[PDB]
Design a protein around this ligand. Structure first.
Ligand SMILES: Cc1ncc(NC(=O)NC2c3ccccc3-c3ccccc32)c(-c2ccccc2)n1
Length: 300
């Protein structure tokens, strides 16, 4: 499964069941459901705090232990915080920080020109500075994963979360194939591929590396500047496979300056070895994110 942390061949904190108090469901997938909950005695000078709890729907017990081990390793400002597990009785639970604004795709769409309707964001569409801040934070999380030699394989805005103060982090609760089924191409009986985010070598040769994740980051950058639109939305799944393998590139979004579109094309070099590194991509976006109003006003 592309995006499943256990596809990486690289101690776990435990929380008592009495310390977790379920509030309501946030979502559900084929592997289980997610709830908002209050977690007691988790962090000092807080006493009580909101968390997102993933409940497991055997080999699944072994998958759970391996997932928990890998999630414990990931500790970064731009990776969704994993607090630990609850193993006393059933269902087994995984506890994560709660991200108020939900997934990045939903956040972009709700703050784009097609939205229906102010604590963390100004009225109307997200400005250039805000779009650059979002992009920079996702790149920072990808720099951290590249540094640990982790290959995501399902990087996309749906697989990022947005918290209070527009803090953006990479992470998901394993429900993207259920919530965003049209973002995947169904092969056989259960295989679902995020082809629109995949480079030619991943589609043609099934090779996944730090470089295929750079390509996916370029597509993320494109989703950010189109306010969450699906890449190749005008194409069917087979038509998108044809365009990607033929070497066609996503058009410059209207809200995207040429400086940013350059960073996107740098992620989309046909040859994996010639794609810019995530360190270089993050350095450029961060520089543009923290540029003074005088400098990015002439970019916009
Ligand atoms: C069946 C299925 N399909 C996709 C899934 N998604 C992931 O493994 N996402 C990882 C990930 C994968 C690469 C790199 C980083 C990170 C990361 C970081 C924070 C939070 C979550 C993740 C899961 C799943 C299993 C346990 C807990 C949460 C999700 N389960």
């Amino acid at each position: 499964l592309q995006g499943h942390i256990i596809e990486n061949p690289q101690c776990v904190h435990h929380i008592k069941r009495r310390d977790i108090v379920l509030k309501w469901e946030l979502g559900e997938g084929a592997f289980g459901k997610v709830f908002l909950a209050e977690c007691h005695n988790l962090l000092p000078e807080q006493d009580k705090m909101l968390v997102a709890v993933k409940a497991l729907k055997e080999s699944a017990r072994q998958d759970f232990q391996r997932e928990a081990e890998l999630l414990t390793m990931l500790q970064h400002q731009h990776i969704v915080r994993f607090f630990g597990v609850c193993t006393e009785g059933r269902p087994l639970l995984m506890v994560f920080e709660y991200m108020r604004h939900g997934d990045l795709n939903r956040f972009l769409r709700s703050h784009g020109p097609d939205a229906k309707l102010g604590e963390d964001v100004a009225p109307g569409p997200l400005g250039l500075g805000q779009l650059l801040a979002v992009a920079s934070q996702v790149a920072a999380g990808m720099v951290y994963l590249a540094g640990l030699h982790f290959v995501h394989r399902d990087l996309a805005t749906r697989n990022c979360l947005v918290g209070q103060g527009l803090v953006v982090k990479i992470g998901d609760f394993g429900m993207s194939r259920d919530i965003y089924s049209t973002d995947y191409y169904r092969v056989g009986g259960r295989t679902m591929l995020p082809i629109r985010w995949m480079p030619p070598e991943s589609i043609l040769y099934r090779k996944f590396t730090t470089e295929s994740d750079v390509w996916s980051f370029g597509v993320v950058l494109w989703e950010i500047f189109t306010y969450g639109k699906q890449p190749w939305y005008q194409l069917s799944n087979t038509e998108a496979i044809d365009c990607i393998t033929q070497g066609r590139e996503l058009e410059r979004p209207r809200a995207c300056p040429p400086e940013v579109y350059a960073i996107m094309r740098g992620c989309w070099q046909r040859e994996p070895q010639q794609r810019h590194s995530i360190k270089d991509v993050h350095a450029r976006l961060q520089a543009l994110a923290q540029a003074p109003p005088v400098y990015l006003d002439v970019l916009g």
